[PDB]
Design a protein around this ligand. Structure first.
Ligand SMILES: *[C@@H]1O[C@H](CO)[C@@H](O)[C@H](O)[C@H]1NC(C)=O
Lengths: 49, 49
């Protein structure tokens, strides 16, 4: 007769990703440059989405 | 079209999400007044809406 055995599945041999290139033009450099922030007491909420 | 607003077929498009860190309970609208150039003999200030 027929007996079922462990299923046959092929794993993917590659993993390569293509990301965006320019879009939003340097998220941290337009308003904060590289590393430059305000004083301690000014805990301003500045999030970039 | 004939109807001023009840009939329509579209969607509202988001642009940017922003925070506002203060309690809000009341709202008020503004308006613009066009300066009216009157004759010197009128001696009065008027606006056109
Ligand atoms: C931004 O930071 C870089 C180095 O981190 C430096 O050129 C300078 O502090 C800032 N750039 C300008 C143009 O001031």
């Amino acid at each position: 007769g027929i007996y079922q055995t462990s299923n046959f599945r092929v794993q993917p041999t590659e993993s390569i990703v293509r990301f965006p290139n320019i879009t939003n033009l340097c998220p941290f450099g337009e308003v904060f440059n590289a590393t430059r922030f305000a004083s301690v007491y000014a805990w301003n909420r500045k999030r970039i989405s | 079209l004939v109807r001023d607003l009840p009939q329509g077929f579209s969607a509202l498009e988001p642009l940017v999400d922003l925070p506002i860190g203060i309690n809000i309970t009341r709202f008020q609208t503004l308006l613009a007044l066009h300066r009216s150039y009157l004759t010197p003999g009128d001696s009065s200030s008027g606006w056109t809406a």
